[PDB]
Scaffold this active site. Structure first.
Site, PDB file in Angstrom:
ATOM      1  N   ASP A 148       0.798  -1.223   0.000  1.00  0.00           N
ATOM      2  CA  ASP A 148       0.000   0.000   0.000  1.00  0.00           C
ATOM      3  C   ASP A 148       0.841   1.289   0.000  1.00  0.00           C
ATOM      4  O   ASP A 148       0.296   2.397   0.028  1.00  0.00           O
ATOM      5  CB  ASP A 148      -0.962   0.009   1.204  1.00  0.00           C
ATOM      6  CG  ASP A 148      -2.243  -0.813   0.966  1.00  0.00           C
ATOM      7  OD1 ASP A 148      -3.342  -0.293   1.277  1.00  0.00           O
ATOM      8  OD2 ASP A 148      -2.165  -1.972   0.496  1.00  0.00           O
ATOM      9  N   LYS A 156       3.719   1.066  -4.600  1.00  0.00           N
ATOM     10  CA  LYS A 156       4.572   0.499  -5.639  1.00  0.00           C
ATOM     11  C   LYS A 156       3.798   0.417  -6.942  1.00  0.00           C
ATOM     12  O   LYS A 156       4.231   0.940  -7.963  1.00  0.00           O
ATOM     13  CB  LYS A 156       5.027  -0.907  -5.285  1.00  0.00           C
ATOM     14  CG  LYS A 156       6.076  -1.002  -4.228  1.00  0.00           C
ATOM     15  CD  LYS A 156       6.383  -2.452  -4.007  1.00  0.00           C
ATOM     16  CE  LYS A 156       5.126  -3.185  -3.630  1.00  0.00           C
ATOM     17  NZ  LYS A 156       4.508  -2.543  -2.456  1.00  0.00           N
ATOM     18  N   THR A 157       2.649  -0.250  -6.896  1.00  0.00           N
ATOM     19  CA  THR A 157       1.820  -0.418  -8.073  1.00  0.00           C
ATOM     20  C   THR A 157       1.363   0.922  -8.628  1.00  0.00           C
ATOM     21  O   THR A 157       1.490   1.169  -9.832  1.00  0.00           O
ATOM     22  CB  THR A 157       0.593  -1.256  -7.757  1.00  0.00           C
ATOM     23  OG1 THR A 157       1.001  -2.478  -7.138  1.00  0.00           O
ATOM     24  CG2 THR A 157      -0.161  -1.578  -9.025  1.00  0.00           C
ATOM     25  N   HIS A 181       4.292  -8.962  -0.611  1.00  0.00           N
ATOM     26  CA  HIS A 181       5.677  -9.059  -0.148  1.00  0.00           C
ATOM     27  C   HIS A 181       6.322 -10.353  -0.620  1.00  0.00           C
ATOM     28  O   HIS A 181       7.421 -10.345  -1.182  1.00  0.00           O
ATOM     29  CB  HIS A 181       5.666  -8.957   1.390  1.00  0.00           C
ATOM     30  CG  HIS A 181       6.947  -9.342   2.067  1.00  0.00           C
ATOM     31  ND1 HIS A 181       8.178  -8.843   1.696  1.00  0.00           N
ATOM     32  CD2 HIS A 181       7.163 -10.099   3.169  1.00  0.00           C
ATOM     33  CE1 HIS A 181       9.096  -9.273   2.545  1.00  0.00           C
ATOM     34  NE2 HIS A 181       8.506 -10.034   3.449  1.00  0.00           N
TER      35      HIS A 181
END
Ligand SMILES: Nc1nc2c(ncn2[C@@H]2O[C@H](COP(=O)(O)OP(=O)(O)O)[C@@H](O)[C@H]2O)c(=O)[nH]1
Ligand SMILES: [Mg+2]
Length: 387
Positions: free
Chosen positions: A15, A18-19, A78
């Protein structure tokens, strides 16, 4: 082709964005230098993949700067990152660690760092995100200390690392003030990331697969030149197992075609002067003279499969004695577990100290597999060599 190609990826805490960053990068870049803009979801819904025998969820994306062309991977959880890092299923000449400005560093932040180094992640850039959610001069600079200093904690140039402040969000919606950070972020990949070391360039090396003796004037061993080049006449070291021994590369043949040099990536059968078939065996490797030493004790980050994927069904314990496949063969080793740890469950990762009975040509960053009756039950990367 020739357009330099670089492999990257967004690591970091869940959260933290990264995306969300990944997206913004292609978009911002498409709009500016032409290309293909990708949707968050098309990225958040990661397909699987099977590497070394496991199952990870990885999304692959592309975008281009002027001089370069980037290959990018962003994970969901992760673990995906974990697996991917340890296996190397996706390479990373650099990594885009992703840090939210509202939380500051987090456990995982650490972990991914920890791994990256452990795994040979040569370079890492930083995007302070959600900056849109923070208007506190002072707060920011604290983070940079927290960071540049955490970074140095794991052997990376904290004081010399780029840190792009931005809002992967605002930039994705279209707030120009914010896009330039993706731009500023981009530029860094180009300038900061030195094009990688190529395999062929790297030191010469070759894992011995098989060994024969033709004619009767020198021997022939086979296997894939893992790296570097081998020029007929350049001597070599046969490291691993029994004492190291020296010789000279007398012949290079690939499909009855007489050649004069082997390049990283090719399968060849090398002709050595003055060495017998009993003086060489699989497991050993052909390496430029002195480019590697054999050991028996090493520190490594390891992952055990699950039952679902095909791994052990129960946990194992100390004094466990599985096998460890290195490029070409298996070697029994004794396992030592971190302080506290008492049994490893299938689906866990643990830095674990293994101790082999025989020596193996090795250097930090090597990846192996763990097996039972020839079945794979885990995987690792030699984090640090000891003995
Ligand atoms: N305010 C704000 N929220 C952001 C920003 N970037 C990402 N987020 C939010 O952070 C959440 C998690 O981001 P995401 O990229 O999915 O993090 P991930 O789990 O590491 O992939 C999402 O709900 C985003 O809307 C940003 O620049 N500003
Ligand atoms: Mg994500």
């Amino acid at each position: 082709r020739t357009k330099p190609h670089v492999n990257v990826g967004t690591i970091g805490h869940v959260d933290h964005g990264k995306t969300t960053l990944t997206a913004a990068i292609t978009t911002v870049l498409a709009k500016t230098y032409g290309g293909a803009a990708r949707a968050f979801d098309q990225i958040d819904n990661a397909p699987e993949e099977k590497a070394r025998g496991i199952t990870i969820n990885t999304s692959h994306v592309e975008y281009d700067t002027p001089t370069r062309h980037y290959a990018h991977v962003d994970c969901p959880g992760h673990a995906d990152y974990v697996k991917n890092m340890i296996t190397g299923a996706a390479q990373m000449d650099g990594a885009i660690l992703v840090v939210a400005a509202t939380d500051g560093p987090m456990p995982q932040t650490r972990e991914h760092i920890l791994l990256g180094r452990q795994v040979g992640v040569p370079y890492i850039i930083v995007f302070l995100n959600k900056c849109d959610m923070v208007d506190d001069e002072e707060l920011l600079e604290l983070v940079e200390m927290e960071v540049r200093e955490l970074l140095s904690q794991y052997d990376f140039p904290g004081d010399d690392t780029p840190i792009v402040r931005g809002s992967a969000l605002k930039a994705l919606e279209g707030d120009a003030e914010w896009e330039a950070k993706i731009l500023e972020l981009a530029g860094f990949l180009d300038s900061y990331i030195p094009e990688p070391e190529r395999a062929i360039d790297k030191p010469f090396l070759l894992p011995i697969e098989d060994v024969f003796s033709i004619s009767g004037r020198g021997t022939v061993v086979t296997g894939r030149v893992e790296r570097g080049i081998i020029k007929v006449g350049e001597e070599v070291e046969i490291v691993g197992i029994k004492e190291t021994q020296k010789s000279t590369c007398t012949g290079v043949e690939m499909f009855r075609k007489l050649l004069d040099e082997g390049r990283a990536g090719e399968n060849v059968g090398v002709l050595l002067r003055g060495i017998k078939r009993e003086e060489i065996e699989r497991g050993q490797v052909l390496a430029k003279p002195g480019t590697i030493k054999p050991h028996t004790k090493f520190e490594s980050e390891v992952y055990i499969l699950s039952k679902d994927e095909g791994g052990r069904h129960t946990p194992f314990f100390k004094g466990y004695r599985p096998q460890f496949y290195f490029r070409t063969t298996d070697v029994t080793g004794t396992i030592e577990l971190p302080e506290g740890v008492e049994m490893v469950m299938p689906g866990d990762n643990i830095k674990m100290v293994v101790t082999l009975i025989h020596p193996i040509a090795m250097d930090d960053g090597l990846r192996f597999a763990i097996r039972e009756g020839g079945r794979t039950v885990g995987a690792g990367v030699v984090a640090k060599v000891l003995g």
